[PDB]
Structure 1
Amino acid sequence: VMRLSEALYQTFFKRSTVYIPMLLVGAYFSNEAIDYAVDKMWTTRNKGKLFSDIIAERT
């Protein structure tokens, strides 16, 4: 039913030497997004208890 596009296949999928650098940039951005989400959730939950909150409070 759902099917990968031919023009998108001929560019990023037909050769491994083009597929691998695309894989590495996607891996970089996926790690950045996961880091951002985990850090935002942790800092939102534990607000007011961290050391940086005390330091920014003393300014």
Structure 2
Amino acid sequence: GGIFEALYKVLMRRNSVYVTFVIAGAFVGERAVDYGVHKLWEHNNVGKRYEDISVLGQRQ
């Protein structure tokens, strides 16, 4: 579409901007996939975590 052409003209008339764009995309996508996998991991198996044992503080 025209959005692809707009993005092309905005970002790629130089090269250092391209390098910065790649680095930023990497260090955003990393965080996004981390959040997604952590959330799915939490959802899959509820009740088994370390903060879910009912007797965690009764050996004083």
TM-score (norm 2): 0.70
Report the CA distance between 1:33 and its aligned residue.
0.9
* Structure number with bigger Rg: 2
Q: What TM-score do you get using the length of structure 1 for normalisation?
A: 0.71
Q: Percent identity?
A: 35
How large is the RMSD of aligned CA atoms in angstroms?
2.4
Deviating runs (4+, > 3 A) in structure 1? none
Q: Kindly tell me the number of residue pairs found equivalent between the two proteins.
A: 56
The CA distance in 1 between the partners of 2:32 and 2:53, in whole Å, is 27
Structure 2: 5+ residue runs without aligned partners? none
Question: CA-to-partner distance for each residue in 1:21-49, whole Å, 9 max, x for gaps?
Answer: 11111111111110011000101111100
